[PDB]
Design a protein around this ligand. Sequence first.
Ligand SMILES: [Fe+3]
Lengths: 198, 212
Amino acid sequence: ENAAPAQAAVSDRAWALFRALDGKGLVPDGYVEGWKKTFEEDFSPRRGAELVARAWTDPEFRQLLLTDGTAAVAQYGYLGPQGEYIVAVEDTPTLKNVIVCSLCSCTAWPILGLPPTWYKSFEYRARVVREPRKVLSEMGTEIASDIEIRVYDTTAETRYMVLPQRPAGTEGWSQEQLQEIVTKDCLIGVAIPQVPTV
Amino acid sequence: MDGVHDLAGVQGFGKVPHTVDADIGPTFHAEWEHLPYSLMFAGVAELGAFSVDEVRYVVERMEPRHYMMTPYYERYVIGVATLMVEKGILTQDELESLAGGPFPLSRPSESEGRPAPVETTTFEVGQRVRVRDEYVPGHIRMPAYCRGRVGTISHRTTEKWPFPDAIGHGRNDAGEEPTYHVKFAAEELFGSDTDGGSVVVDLFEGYLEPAA
Ligand SMILES: [Fe+3]
């Protein structure tokens, strides 16, 4: 009945696609290797942390992110393929924002980075829209009852980024320091920035 | 297309395999993983054979069971290959002989497409709007949980993009439309069966209609 279709080893099939196109000279020399480096080294959440840290320290920039995110990001030259129209959503003491792409895995590559396996998993895609609080708690983030949870589903071309709340423990920390607190998960809206007392 | 890809809302899944700030490991857990993305841009940008919208649709066009059993990156290897074959760039025979084995692609579309609408109703921020209650067999960018639901607009996009119902098929009727950020109250979408406050969906102008 529901038998899985016969297929060759996945690697064999991945390289067969490559070898086919390459044999016809449809793929530029160094093209594939070039992109790999971009994905691994260039697209990094560190760029997102940078924007957040600055937004905490400089109120003028904060307003730029919240009003014209694309401009603010362009100002750093952190624009890219899956991140041409950026909108930053901020977390107030009574609001928590989370991002999802139920239909696929659309994320702001240049600022957050390539989507992690769990972000593109059937369970996250299906559950977070209906039961955010349950999903977050299981992940390790407990959101109080008086805090409204807003889930943004990346359907069109808009790519989101979350502007977390500034942890009270940082009395006059430097931008450099604040940068280490803002982790990838904070940018996706799944985690809350905490002061590493280790 | 009301296919398995439209997971939002589906009940039965276990828990998300992740603890906040846990180590996700390398960006690519396998050597072949960077290929699907790269070869996609090679077709979109370099060759100009298809659009990103067409890549999404080919994955959606996967046989349901095939979709569920296949991992993320492998879904795109199969998709890009299917497009390559449908555009006439490659031949399934080559793929198979080069792979050394079977290479099942996605199923052929059963919908020509949907041109962009000519009824240009421009909405403003703060307006209540209802999502058109319509069923499109082909590509579309509206999650099933929106049909007939009413929400409020919180942002209209300054830029315009091509209608995905058309361009996702390779039609020229694409046009250009701005997208809106329609905020829906959780209660409106899932009734009492909701653990949250509100969901914000980014919908194309052609999907909405004034609520009155
Ligand atoms: Fe996606």
